[PDB]
Structure 1
Amino acid sequence: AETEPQVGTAQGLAWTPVGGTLLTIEVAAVPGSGKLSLTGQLGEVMKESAQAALTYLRAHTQDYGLPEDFYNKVDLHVHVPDGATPKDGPSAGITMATAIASALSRRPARMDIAMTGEVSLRGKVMPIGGVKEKLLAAHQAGIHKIVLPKDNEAQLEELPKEVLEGLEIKLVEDVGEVLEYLLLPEPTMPPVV
């Protein structure tokens, strides 16, 4: 795991049949005309999750200090390293929105906090699956903060007792809670346009 706040990226979790892994979502915001490129061998549901997170952020510009018109002035590129492994499912919506909001607002994001959950178009956090493998993988790599949907607190019983002593889980229902908790409050970079 990283240890430095990085503007434009966020730490996420994934589920494989051999255990959990770590996703890292990278977003760049460059001057352009309004486009959305999605690289990293992404599946279709994960592309739709990215589009849902972006449409949520286009409706709440003044809430987060975003630029007023980035829908036709800024090109966005979302890349999920590495490039050779295929990826899917809807569990990465909150990581998408954190990465895109940090990239547009030019304020860094904390990298010591893993997160997971599905986002909707109103900003609601919906529950996900495969949670205990993801929490094991987050614990074995030295991450001690988890952001999790509130409808998954019935899923924490399957963990070993020694695992959930070290973690501290924050339960959420709204994306604004997540963006208040992850982003550092003042910008470090000049604006895009």
Structure 2
Amino acid sequence: TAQGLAWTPVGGTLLTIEVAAVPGSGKLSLTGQLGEVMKESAQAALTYLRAHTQDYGLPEDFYNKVDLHVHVPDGATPKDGPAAGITMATAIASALSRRPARMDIAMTGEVSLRGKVMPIGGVKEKLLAAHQAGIHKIVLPKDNEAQLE
């Protein structure tokens, strides 16, 4: 689990983004039925994850043996905009280790397919959307240098 973050019109809170690291065919699954925000970005993040899998103990045949039920809640995009990439990146990094991810960390960001974390917007609502729901720790993309200026 990586508790991603969203700016919803029903309450500022965290997306409990759980991803399944379960042995099986080796694939990724559609969960919130969104696609253009979560599956493609997760796939792109998974590309750089496929750079250096054995840094993390990841069995290289995970796409050959581990099916990924990768679930961003609120179904489709709650923020209506990719703001939650590095979220599913660290989520699958924790899950595919089959090790406990931490808790009280609600986070944000958007990774690229090139070991790059792209700059994001909609961050003010995310920094808000943590403090509404009992959180005081987020992750931010580095390229957003003007975000803390």
TM range (shorter): 0.7 to 0.9
* C-alpha separation in 1, matches of 2:16 and 2:67: 20
Relative to structure 1, is the Cα distance of residues 84 and 131 closer, same or farther in structure 2, using a 3 angstrom cutoff?
closer
Relative to structure 1, is the Cα distance of residues 73 and 92 closer, same or farther in structure 2, using a 3 angstrom cutoff?
same
Q: Which has the higher contact order (CA 8 A, sep 6+)?
A: 2
* C-alpha separation in 2, matches of 1:42 and 1:109: 24
Q: CA deviation at 1:150?
A: 2.3
- The number of aligned residues is 147
Deviation string 1:76-104 (CA, Å, 9 cap, x unpaired) is 11122345886753211111111111111
Relative to structure 1, is the Cα distance of residues 26 and 87 closer, same or farther in structure 2, using a 3 angstrom cutoff?
farther
* C-alpha separation in 2, matches of 1:71 and 1:95: 20
- Which of 74, 84, 93 aligns to 1:92? It is 84
Asked which structure has the greater CA Rg, the reply is: 1
**Deviating more after overlay: 81-90 vs 29-38:** 81-90
Relative to structure 1, is the Cα distance of residues 82 and 100 closer, same or farther in structure 2, using a 3 angstrom cutoff?
same
> Which ranges of structure 1 fall in alignment gaps of 5 or more residues?
1-8, 156-193
**TM value normalised by structure 2:** 0.85
Relative to structure 1, is the Cα distance of residues 23 and 94 closer, same or farther in structure 2, using a 3 angstrom cutoff?
same
**Deviating more after overlay: 80-89 vs 65-74:** 80-89
Relative to structure 1, is the Cα distance of residues 53 and 123 closer, same or farther in structure 2, using a 3 angstrom cutoff?
same
**Deviating more after overlay: 76-85 vs 126-135:** 76-85
CA contact (8 A) 2:12 2:133 kept: no
Q: CA deviation at 1:152?
A: 2.8
CA contact (8 A) 1:50 1:96 kept: yes
Relative to structure 1, is the Cα distance of residues 145 and 23 closer, same or farther in structure 2, using a 3 angstrom cutoff?
same
Q: CA deviation at 1:75?
A: 1.1
Q: CA RMSD in A?
A: 2.3
**TM value normalised by structure 1:** 0.67
CA contact (8 A) 1:41 1:85 kept: no
Q: Does 1:137 align with 2:129?
A: yes
The structure with the largest strand share of the pair is: 1
CA contact (8 A) 2:46 2:113 kept: no
Deviation string 1:2-29 (CA, Å, 9 cap, x unpaired) is xxxxxxx101111246774421211112
Q: Secondary structure at the match of 1:77?
A: strand
* C-alpha separation in 1, matches of 2:18 and 2:82: 17
CA contact (8 A) 1:25 1:99 kept: yes
Q: Secondary structure at the match of 1:87?
A: coil
Q: CA deviation at 1:41?
A: 2.9
CA contact (8 A) 2:13 2:132 kept: no
**Deviating more after overlay: 126-135 vs 143-152:** 143-152
Relative to structure 1, is the Cα distance of residues 59 and 84 closer, same or farther in structure 2, using a 3 angstrom cutoff?
closer
Deviation string 1:117-140 (CA, Å, 9 cap, x unpaired) is 111112211111111111112112
Quote the residue 1:114 is aligned against.
106
Q: CA deviation at 1:154?
A: 2.3
